[PDB]
Nucleic acid binder design. Structure first.
Ligand SMILES: [Mg+2]
Ligand SMILES: [Mg+2]
Ligand SMILES: [Mg+2]
Ligand SMILES: [Mg+2]
Ligand SMILES: [Mg+2]
Ligand SMILES: [Mg+2]
Ligand SMILES: [Mg+2]
Ligand SMILES: [Mg+2]
Ligand SMILES: [Mg+2]
Ligand SMILES: [Mg+2]
Ligand SMILES: [Mg+2]
Ligand SMILES: [Mg+2]
Ligand SMILES: [Mg+2]
Ligand SMILES: [Mg+2]
Ligand SMILES: [Mg+2]
Ligand SMILES: [Mg+2]
Ligand SMILES: [Mg+2]
Ligand SMILES: [Mg+2]
Ligand SMILES: [Mg+2]
Ligand SMILES: [Mg+2]
Ligand SMILES: [Mg+2]
Ligand SMILES: [Mg+2]
Lengths: 83, 100, 128, 115, 150, 211, 101
RNA sequence: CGGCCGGGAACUCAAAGGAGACUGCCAGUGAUAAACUGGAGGAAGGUGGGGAUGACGUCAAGUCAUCAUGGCCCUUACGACCAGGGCUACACACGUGCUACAAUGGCGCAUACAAAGAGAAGCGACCUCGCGAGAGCAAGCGGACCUCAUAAAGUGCGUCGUAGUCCGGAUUGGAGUCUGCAACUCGACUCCAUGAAGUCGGAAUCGCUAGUAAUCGUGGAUCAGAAUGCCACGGUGAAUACG
């Protein structure tokens, strides 16, 4: 994981989007490609459509997801079984 | 390799040399122990905003004569095949077949 | 007095032996024979030339060794003692040669070769 | 003898016998024994009742046995309920730390199931 | 060697007792180039065997060799598409090699704790005809007689 | 089977290097690249001047190029104007002052590179390959080469199936390291593709080594 | 006066030997005494390259660059010796590094 | 009490140039022979060891994705730029390796002996902090000088006493370090906790003739980070070959 004395990583454009959405109450989902950004406590209760390579899968950010990655909440491979 | 790939490498080297100083200073202020938290946060954000190709970790060494990205040798700046061809032609000083 | 000298070599070990008439002292690298070689086989190997000619307790040895390991250094010391005795007497040539101590064991370590795991060990082959 | 609700082997040395507790390893065994002022070489059935109480207190200083088991199960349940990638891997019974699954996952998959 | 001219290799004697037989025994027991370990094992085994029988270390080792030594073995010779185990007398060097090898195998497949003690017990059972190596020699001779006809 | 490059196996024994400068790891790559560019440019600019060899030396802060050619007059030009131009462009490419020295090879029929280039030129002018290589071998053996082998490979005559033909005269001992074997190669680009030419010329066995 | 060291590096030992011979002959001609050339350990950089264009890992070539080093010390350097050495015009292909003190 | 410091060219060592080994000598065998066997001398003996070196050709072998190239095809697209994803999937089959199944061993304490390499957008000492990965200050070193860098196996003492164990380490949970714009898919390493299978492996099959096999560590290229692979280096060091 990221070194602590550096801190948690978040993309600037996603940070700006989240700031606008929390300051304006915009319930429309945040379409983003920044899978690598960490979920911050100020995103709690927000719908984010995170890219998975082919589409933007929505994740409802709640309190338990803080510290994890949107990429952790958007699977990239489709597998339903061999037989 | 493709001319597009070779141009990509040239452009990456150009940008990497252009943005060296800011890159280094931002990394220094981020790494510093005796630095403010707001200062470190702002430095992180600015480093994130610099163009990606300005990072030297993105450039891949290529044979200077063919652009092949594999089999590189930093001493000669060439891939294995061109190294061997020039060595056999005697154009690389001191390099000769080794037995021991 | 005369401090006769002999250079020994084995594998990657070189030894410098200085023999002078005296007591039975053997001081290898400022240490006693046992303290340098705890292994009794190595101690015996070093003692072999002095036991062959009846001069075990009448010569003092000052020995330096570098390189190699335990067995290589014992062999180098034996070789150096042999040469020093040879310079000291020159009649012991026949006996030491017959015992085989005069020959420099030249067996070195084969370099690793391309396509093989070791000097000769080849990767496992499968028909299918 | 009886520490943290289990019987500790009587004939083994204190450190290894103390390692029988779920949640106590070699390093924690050394730490407990040094915090109770007791030699590691001494066999467990060579000690007095007071020393066993000191060991009891030092083990109660750590989270062991059923408390640790339920903490671990709750952490895995939290992962699985959260729906993260790790939770999905736990749900599906596949290696969770990036190990290859094309072959070599038999510790998680169990004995081989022929088609 | 189809071309031939292969010859045996000179082996130095052991330090403590100066015997080529003991040196070969140490080499046969040695694994992974750890000659010091094998030499210490052999020396401890010989010391305890000297305590057990009190004749000599080298003499005790020789007596165990005497008991174990095979006199004839069986070599395959294909005759009718199939093979016939033909009995052939073993030359003394190979006799010693096989005796030492069987002793080491029997000592390894034992139940005692330490290797030195396993070797000592195997040597005693060989010198009193009650060991696995003794059994192996008896088996070889028994099969040779059974296949005398070939 | 595949055969080692003769010059490569004999470098430092009877053959000299074509690049005889010293550099540390910092400037090794750049010097190799600059020498490659200089050799490429000079080859392209003197392709019609029978240039046999280019020896690049980098003394101190300069570069000196020795050009072994069969037509030193046509390389020098009128009174040195062409040499001046070449020095200018070479210095431009190398980034350091340049100096060009011309060395004449009086026996072009004994130089492997020149023989291969002549065969390639004849092939691109559509001369019959067998006649070309036979004449090359006869010329060299007549001018005194102790031996010569020429090999021409690849779609000879515009045929569908490629083949390789070779001719040898005298002795060409490739496994003898002290043998002086001048080897070189060339490619002829004709309307049916690439035709490869290889020439070995054996000119005696240097006995003193002389590096 | 302080001794001056000259380290000669080269890829060819005949070239470096001849250059060192010239330096020592000059220095002994011009008055000073020289405590050198001390052959120093020669470096051998080895490179292993695949030779086939596409496949066959086991077919490889091994090359080496051998850098030879000589060390020459000029002790009691006459005023003339320094500039004579700096105008000796050593052969091309020999890197010469001159240190003082 | 340290080659450390005056000092010495003795010795190891560093390279450069040479000497030496050729069935040369003796005896036997042999066909009045080539050669073979044995012996002396010798550091080396019969090609002393190893490497590089691959004949004419076979396989329409491999490579148009290193490169070059004849032809054929696309040209608001089969060309070019960007972000995210994939090459890391997983019922299964096969090949090559690593680690084990233990006592010739595991663990703890003390202590000994290498070679060859790499280093300037680099190697990074000493000292302080951290259990540890590491962090802070920072000398030296384009290096027989400085750093990487304490070799491991070994030796001596103790314990474990044949257990699925003080064997084995997979797997998993928690907490961290570093590189990097960024470690979710998808890094390496550290600490704590858990402790799967595994008790020597069927038909069958592979490598190896001596400093070899086996075993123990070290270095390098590629490389911001990322080897159980590859390429090198040394330590201990066998069994057998009748045919
Ligand atoms: Mg192209
Ligand atoms: Mg990279
Ligand atoms: Mg392989
Ligand atoms: Mg992985
Ligand atoms: Mg080849
Ligand atoms: Mg002889
Ligand atoms: Mg040959
Ligand atoms: Mg084909
Ligand atoms: Mg093939
Ligand atoms: Mg194909
Ligand atoms: Mg992309
Ligand atoms: Mg792949
Ligand atoms: Mg170096
Ligand atoms: Mg067991
Ligand atoms: Mg364990
Ligand atoms: Mg653990
Ligand atoms: Mg089981
Ligand atoms: Mg062989
Ligand atoms: Mg290894
Ligand atoms: Mg490295
Ligand atoms: Mg790396
Ligand atoms: Mg080895």
């Amino acid at each position: 994981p990221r070194s602590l004395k550096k801190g948690p990583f978040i993309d600037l454009h996603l940070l700006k989007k989240v700031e606008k959405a929390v300051e304006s109450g915009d319930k429309k989902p945040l379409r983003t490609w920044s899978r690598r950004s960490t979920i911050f406590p100020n995103m709690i209760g927000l719908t984010i459509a995170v890219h998975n390579g082919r589409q933007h899968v929505p994740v409802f950010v709640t309190d338990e997801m803080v510290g994890h990655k949107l990429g952790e909440f958007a699977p990239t491979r489709t597998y339903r079984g061999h037989a | 390799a493709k001319q597009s790939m070779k141009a990509r490498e040239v452009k990456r080297v150009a940008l990497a040399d252009k943005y060296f100083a800011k890159r280094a200073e931002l990394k220094a202020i981020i790494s510093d122990v005796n630095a403010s938290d707001e200062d470190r946060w702002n430095a992180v954000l600015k480093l994130q905003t610099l163009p990606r190709d300005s990072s030297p970790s993105r450039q891949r060494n290529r044979c200077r004569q063919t652009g092949r990205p594999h089999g590189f040798l930093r001493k000669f700046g060439l891939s294995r095949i061109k190294v061997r061809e020039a060595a056999m032609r005697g154009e690389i000083p001191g390099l000769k077949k080794a037995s021991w | 007095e005369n401090q006769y000298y002999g250079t020994g070599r084995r594998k990657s070990s070189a030894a410098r032996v200085f023999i002078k008439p005296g007591n039975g002292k053997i001081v290898i690298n400022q240490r006693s024979l046992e303290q340098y070689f705890g292994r009794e086989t190595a101690r015996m190997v070093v003692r072999q030339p002095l036991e062959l000619v009846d001069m075990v307790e009448k010569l003092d040895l000052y020995i330096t060794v570098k390189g190699g390991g335990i067995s290589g250094q014992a062999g180098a010391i034996r070789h150096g003692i042999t040469r020093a005795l040879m310079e000291y007497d020159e009649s012991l040539r026949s006996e030491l040669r017959k015992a085989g101590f005069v020959t420099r064991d030249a067996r070195q370590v084969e370099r690793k070769k391309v396509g093989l795991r070791k000097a000769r060990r080849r990767p496992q082959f499968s028909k299918r | 003898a009886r520490i943290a609700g289990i019987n500790i082997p009587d004939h083994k040395h204190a450190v290894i016998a103390l390692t029988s507790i779920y949640g106590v390893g070699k390093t924690r065994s050394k730490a407990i024994l040094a915090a109770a002022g007791i030699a590691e070489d001494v066999k467990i059935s060579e000690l007095s009742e007071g020393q066993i109480d000191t060991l009891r207190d030092e083990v109660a200083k750590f989270v062991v046995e059923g408390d640790l088991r339920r903490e671990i199960s709750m952490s895995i349940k939290r992962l699985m309920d959260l729906g993260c990638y790790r939770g999905l891997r736990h749900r599906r019974g596949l290696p969770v730390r990036g190990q290859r699954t094309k072959t070599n996952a038999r510790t998680r998959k169990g004995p081989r199931k022929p088609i | 060697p189809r071309r031939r001219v292969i010859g045996q290799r000179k082996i130095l004697p052991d330090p403590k007792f100066g015997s080529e037989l003991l040196a070969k025994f140490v080499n046969i027991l040695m694994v992974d180039g750890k000659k010091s370990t094998a030499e210490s094992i052999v020396y401890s085994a010989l010391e305890t065997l000297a305590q057990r029988s009190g004749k000599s270390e080298l003499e005790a080792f020789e007596v165990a060799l005497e008991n174990v030594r095979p006199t004839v073995e069986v070599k395959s010779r294909r005759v009718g598409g199939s093979t016939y185990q033909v009995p052939v007398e073993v030359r003394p060097v190979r006799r010693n090699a096989l005796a030492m090898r069987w002793i080491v195998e029997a000592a390894r497949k034992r139940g005692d704790k330490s290797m030195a003690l396993r070797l000592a017990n195997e040597l005693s059972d060989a010198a009193e005809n009650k060991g696995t190596a003794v059994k192996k020699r008896e088996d070889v001779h028994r099969m040779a007689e059974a296949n005398k006809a070939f | 089977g595949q055969k080692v490059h003769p010059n490569g196996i004999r470098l430092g024994i009877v053959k000299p290097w074509n690049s005889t400068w010293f550099a540390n790891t910092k400037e090794f790559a750049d010097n190799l690249d600059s020498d490659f560019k200089v050799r490429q440019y000079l080859t392209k600019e003197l392709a019609k001047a029978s240039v046999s060899r280019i020896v690049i030396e980098r003394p101190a802060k300069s570069i000196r190029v020795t050009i072994h050619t069969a037509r030193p007059g046509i390389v020098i030009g009128k009174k040195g104007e062409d040499v001046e131009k070449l020095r200018k462009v070479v210095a431009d490419i190398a980034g350091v002052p340049a100096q060009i020295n011309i060395a004449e090879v009086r026996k072009p029929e004994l130089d492997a590179k020149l023989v291969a280039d002549s065969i390639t030129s004849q092939l691109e002018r559509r001369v019959m390959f067998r006649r070309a290589m036979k004449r090359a071998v006869q010329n060299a053996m007549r001018l005194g080469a102790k031996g010569i082998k020429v090999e021409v490979s690849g779609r000879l005559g515009g045929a569908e199936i490629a083949r390789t033909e070779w001719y040898r005269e005298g002795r060409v001992p490739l496994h003898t390291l002290r043998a002086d074997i001048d080897y070189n190669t060339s490619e002829a680009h004709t309307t049916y593709g690439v035709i490869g030419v290889k020439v070995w010329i054996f000119k005696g066995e240097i006995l003193g080594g002389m590096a | 006066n302080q001794r001056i060291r000259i380290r000669l590096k080269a890829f060819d030992h005949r070239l470096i030997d001849q250059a060192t011979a010239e330096i020592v002959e000059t220095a002994k001609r011009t008055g000073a005494q020289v405590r050198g050339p001390i052959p120093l350990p020669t470096r051998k950089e080895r490179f292993t390259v695949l030779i086939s264009p596409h496949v066959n890992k086991d077919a490889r070539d091994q090359y080496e660059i051998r850098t030879h080093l000589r060390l020459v010390d000029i002790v009691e350097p006459t005023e003339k010796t320094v500039d004579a050495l700096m105008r000796l015009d050593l052969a091309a292909g020999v890197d010469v590094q001159i240190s003082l003190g």
